[PDB]
């Protein structure tokens, strides 16, 4: 047992809202199993989503966020988190802003991962092509033969 004021309920609900929120923004195929939740928690998810949408239309923020280097993203996360709350104040807007920042690190890490995956997979593909297909492709007179094949 334990009401909304218990540390357990706070961590539990906190996990749900944050995951709901990050998954939501990271969807904008291969999608994610949405986070099942109650009526009040949906109402909260809904509102977080709106605040996040409004943050996305803040061009200053998006500029600086894209500007920052996420080679060591954990360092960045903790440095920003600490700086945000260092003046000893707390309010709901900063908590929301923190959640927003977390979702942006996800996207940012994802962005650096994409060209890595591509290069790796291209490596396999071009290795296969060179050792198995090159002979046949030369027989066509190179990729100019694919032009003919498409009609162009």
């Amino acid at each position: 047992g334990g009401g909304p004021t218990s540390s357990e309920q706070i961590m539990k609900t906190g996990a749900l809202l944050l995951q709901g929120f990050i998954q939501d923004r990271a969807g904008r195929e291969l999608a994610l199993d949405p986070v099942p939740q109650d009526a009040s928690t949906k109402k909260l998810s809904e509102s977080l989503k709106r605040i996040g949408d409004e943050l996305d239309s803040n061009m200053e923020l998006q500029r600086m966020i894209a500007a920052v280097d996420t080679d060591s993203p954990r360092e960045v996360f903790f440095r920003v988190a600490a700086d945000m709350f260092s003046d000893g104040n707390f309010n709901w807007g900063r908590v929301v802003a923190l959640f927003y920042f977390a979702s942006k690190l996800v996207l940012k890490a994802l962005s650096t991962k994409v060209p890595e995956l591509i290069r790796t997979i291209m490596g396999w593909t071009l290795d296969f092509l060179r050792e198995r297909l090159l002979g046949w492709i030369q027989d066509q007179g190179g990729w100019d033969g694919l032009l003919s094949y498409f009609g162009t």
Binding site: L61, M64, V68, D69, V80, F85, D87, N89, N91, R94
Partner: peptide, 24 residues
């Protein structure tokens, strides 16, 4: 580096400011 430290403080202050303003 030294400028990245600046961008990070910046992001923080901005996030804190946006959060202070989400009230009204």
């Amino acid at each position: 580096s030294e400028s990245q430290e600046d961008i990070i403080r910046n992001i923080a202050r901005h996030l804190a400011q946006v959060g202070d303003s989400m009230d009204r």
